[PDB]
């Protein structure tokens, strides 16, 4: 490719520079060089060499303009990469974009912590019509989640269930004909059809 | 994620069996598991509202849910990950069932395929990440999670074993394949000794588990290149497994490494290896230890119980090495057998030293209906060496395994052949033959160690005998005297015996003096007035007990054909071979009330064979295109007697009506084709056969055939059948009744 070479060769004296901030733990004159230095692969491999640590904390505070593409890019365990990044902008919209990206992803992540995604996301209030909507369809899941535990019909090794319920959201036609009517959760459905506003009258009735 | 659509990993194989680098770039999906997605709530909710996406999106429809969510509950399986796989094959009914199982199937294959196969670029991309060694024995754990049993746990009340057994048989497979893999990567020679361990470790975690035949494949052969792993980590196993033994309970793991030392002896004759080690210390104190911890039985349990070819080929090395490197071990317990018994001993007792014995049987076992492997044994003049040496060892109790260890040796008729000149030229057949001659007297004049002996003793001249040819002439003359001899004392061996004779016995005219030996021996005793019962009495009193009948059945099946000399039983009674059918009377007749099914076949076959052949045994086209002798004398006369009696038509024919192992099968081509041969010649016997000897008339047997519906019924539906003598046959019936 272009060269190798000079990629293996950079790393090892990147490798050097990590490898001395490391012993310096008069420390800030040191740190606040190498970040106040125009090195886009440096400090890409320094934030790389950060996370390792856990110093992903740390990563909130560098000012350094090559940061803000850093976690951009390697936003898609980079959760905390985006616990990182929605915290990161102080800015409201951008901060919401990505709660809400975070919920609907595809690792897994609870439904409680996707509503917590939702419930900070919508506090930061089209965008916010896609969000409204993911809570309501969240919400039903935990109310059909709720009354699996109490439903006896139920088996607790059908867990998969529950995993499916908090792994993520649902088409709604997929929750109302697989959940609602085979648990027959009548009030389930008959919330899910107000969501979907589904009209007519003889259903519903 | 990886693609979950069969599609691509089929045609990837077929590609192979072409391989095209874009679509193996696709690469990792050959992960195996599926490790991340289980079965997910929140997957659940997404599916339930009937949109869902993939990682475009589709509406899913209440019956595909349903589909769908069987899925998830049958295989623990996220719910989308089910849906790409209703996606992906044609929907029909539980078609993703069959594309989860596909999706797995070849992709085991494909890295089957590689590692196997290829030497090559692609093979070291496979391996390169170093994903898929980590990934193999945990792909293994997966299929072993009891996730089948449980649900069937639950399931008892509603069970459907049809669908279970759909998915045992996939994850067999799979383990099978999984086997493969593993062995390849020994032949790969990944790094070393950690793998070894942590894989002895997770063996260990299955005593009577038959699964770990499957792991048997990849630990010989490993242990066989011992060369490849670097001499410092050998020398850190050795240390290991000594200080190792303690595992009473793991008697695989002994068995292991007791295999593990037969390699290393061959491999520490390296310099630098061998001298560092004492030989006492370092190896025959551990592996006298092992036999003791019951390796030897494990091995032969192996060997008895059962990706053929590498677990054969690489068991069959396992063996040998055993053989060659190993015989100073096989001394120091032979001869420690020898003295441990003492002149009331229960077979635990027996058993115990027995290590040698069960080395024997090992071998029997593990050649059995090998011809491939076995000749390997006789084709040179150390394995020969093996031979020889065991016949030397004089014990009854390891005679005795030797007498049956070589019969397994025998199998081809090629191998028979040797084992013909074994004996009769570099113990003799003779004195077998003497032997058994021995034990006759000692028998008589009386009136378990001696059932055993003899059971071998019979079991190895019988297996030589069948296969071979002119010897059987030769064999004949050292052991039919004696045989016949044995028949006459009572055993338990009897039948045995019968079978032995009848293996000797010749196609040719040579015959007669066979047959002089039964007449003589089922007369002997005999009180026969003018009843017919009492020429029957004569033969149930001698063949008193069902395997003397079954060995009987035997012995006078193979006479029959081209069965006998004229006036037999002259003399002693009123002459001719008739009194024999009246017998099968006996038998033929309870046969029908016999306690067990397998035996009941077991004696009915033979019987139909006779009865077939009998009707064979005239020429019936000369007539219909001294004589009145010999229309006498054959016992085709008899045998239509007999036949035209109600219980010997009727039970010929429920065979016909009851039909379908593949061996009742036979008993039911004999059962419709010696119909058709009665039906054929009927009439020749009322009106040619009859008169001429002379009893009593035909009727009966037409009401039963003509008027027995569902015989005619069963015959029809026979047409159809595929075996060919079946239907051709059963045509033909229809034709000569009507």
Known sequence: DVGLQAFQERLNSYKCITDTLQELVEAGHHFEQMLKLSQRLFSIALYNWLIQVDLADKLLQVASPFLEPHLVRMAKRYMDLLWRYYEKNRSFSNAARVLSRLADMHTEISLQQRLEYIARAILSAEFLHELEEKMEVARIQLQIQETLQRQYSHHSSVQDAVSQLDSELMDITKLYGEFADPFKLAECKLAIIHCAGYSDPILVQ | ?738
């Open chain 2, 1 to 738: 994620s990886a693609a979950s659509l069969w599609g691509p990993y089929k045609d990837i194989w077929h590609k192979v069996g072409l391989l095209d680098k874009i679509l193996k770039k696709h690469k990792p999906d050959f992960i195996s598991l599926f490790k991340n997605p289980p079965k997910n709530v929140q997957q659940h909710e997404k599916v339930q509202k009937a949109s869902t996406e993939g990682v475009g999106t589709r509406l899913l429809p209440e019956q595909l849910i349903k589909e769908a969510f069987i899925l998830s509950d049958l295989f623990d399986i996220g719910e989308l990950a089910a849906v790409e796989l209703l996606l992906a094959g044609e929907h029909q009914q539980l078609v993703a069932v069959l594309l989860y199982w596909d999706g797995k199937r070849c992709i085991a294959n494909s890295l089957k395929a590689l590692i196997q196969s290829r030497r090559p670029e692609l093979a070291s991309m496979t391996t390169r990440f170093t994903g898929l060694t980590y990934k193999v024995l945990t792909l293994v754990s997966q299929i072993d999670v009891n996730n089948e049993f449980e649900k069937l746990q639950r399931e008892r009340g509603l069970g459907s074993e049809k669908h279970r057994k759909e998915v045992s048989d996939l994850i067999k497979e799979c383990r099978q394949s999984l086997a493969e893999s593993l062995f390849a990567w020994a032949c790969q020679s990944p790094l070393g000794k950690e793998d070894t361990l942590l894989l002895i470790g997770h063996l260990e975690r299955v005593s009577l588990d038959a699964v770990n035949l499957a792991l048997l494949m990849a630990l010989l052969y490993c242990f066989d290149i011992s060369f490849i792993e670097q001499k410092q980590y050998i020398a850190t196993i050795h240390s290991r497994l000594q200080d190792s033994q303690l595992w009473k309970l793991p008697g695989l793991q002994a068995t292991v490494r007791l295999a593990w030392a037969l390699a290393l002896r061959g491999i520490s004759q390296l310099p630098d290896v061998t001298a560092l080690a004492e030989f006492t210390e370092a190896d025959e104190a551990m592996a006298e230890l092992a036999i003791a911890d019951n390796v030897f039985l494990f091995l032969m349990e192996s060997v008895v119980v059962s990706q053929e070819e590498f677990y054969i080929r690489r068991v069959h090395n396992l063996i040998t090495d055993f053989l060659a490197l190993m015989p100073m071990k096989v001394k120091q317990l032979r001869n420690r057998a020898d003295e441990d018994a003492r002149m009331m001993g229960n077979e635990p007792p027996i058993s115990l030293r027995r290590d040698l014995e069960h080395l024997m049987l090992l071998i029997g076992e593990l050649y059995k209906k090998n011809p491939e492997l076995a000749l390997e044994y006789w084709c040179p003049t150390v394995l020969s060496k093996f031979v020889r040496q065991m016949g030397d060892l004089l014990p009854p109790t390891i005679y005795i395994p030797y007498l049956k260890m070589l019969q397994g040796l025998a199998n081809g008729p090629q191998c028979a052949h040797y084992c013909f000149s074994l004996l009769k030229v570099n113990v003799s057949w003779e004195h077998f033959f003497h032997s058994l001659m021995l034990y006759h007297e000692h028998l008589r004049k009386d009136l378990q160690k001696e059932q055993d002996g003899l059971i071998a003793f019979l079991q190895l001249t019988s297996t030589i005998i069948t296969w071979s040819e002119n010897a059987r002439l030769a064999l004949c003359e050292t052991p039919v005297v004696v045989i016949l001899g044995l028949l006459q004392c009572s055993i338990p061996l009897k039948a045995e015996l019968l079978k032995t004779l009848a293996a000797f016995g010749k196609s040719p005219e040579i015959a007669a003096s066979l047959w002089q030996s039964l007449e003589y021996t089922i007369l002997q005793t005999v009180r026969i007035p003018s009843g017919i019962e009492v020429e029957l009495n004569e033969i149930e009193s001698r063949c008193e007990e069902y395997p003397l009948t079954r060995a009987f059945c035997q012995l006078i099946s193979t006479l029959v054909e081209s069965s006998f000399p004229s006036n037999l039983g002259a003399g002693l009674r009123p002459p001719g071979f008739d009194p024999y059918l009246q017998f099968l009377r006996d038998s033929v007749f309870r046969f029908r009330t016999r306690a067990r099914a397998a035996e009941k076949w077991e004696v009915a076959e033979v019987v139909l064979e006779v009865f077939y052949k009998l009707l064979r045994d005239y020429e019936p086209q000369l007539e219909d295109f001294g004589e009145e002798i010999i229309a006498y004398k054959p016992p085709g006369f008899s045998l239509m007697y007999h036949l035209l009696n109600e219980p010997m038509l009727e039970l010929a024919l429920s065979l016909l009506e009851e039909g379908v192992k593949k061996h009742l099968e036979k008993a039911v081509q004999h059962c419709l084709a010696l119909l058709n041969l009665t039906l054929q010649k009927e009439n020749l016997f009322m009106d040619l056969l009859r008169e001429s000897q002379l009893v009593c008339p035909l009727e009966q047997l037409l009401q039963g055939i003509n008027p027995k519906a569902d015989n005619v019924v069963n015959i029809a539906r026979y047409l159809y059948h595929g075996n060919p003598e079946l239907a051709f046959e059963s045509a033909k019936i229809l034709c000569c009744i009507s």
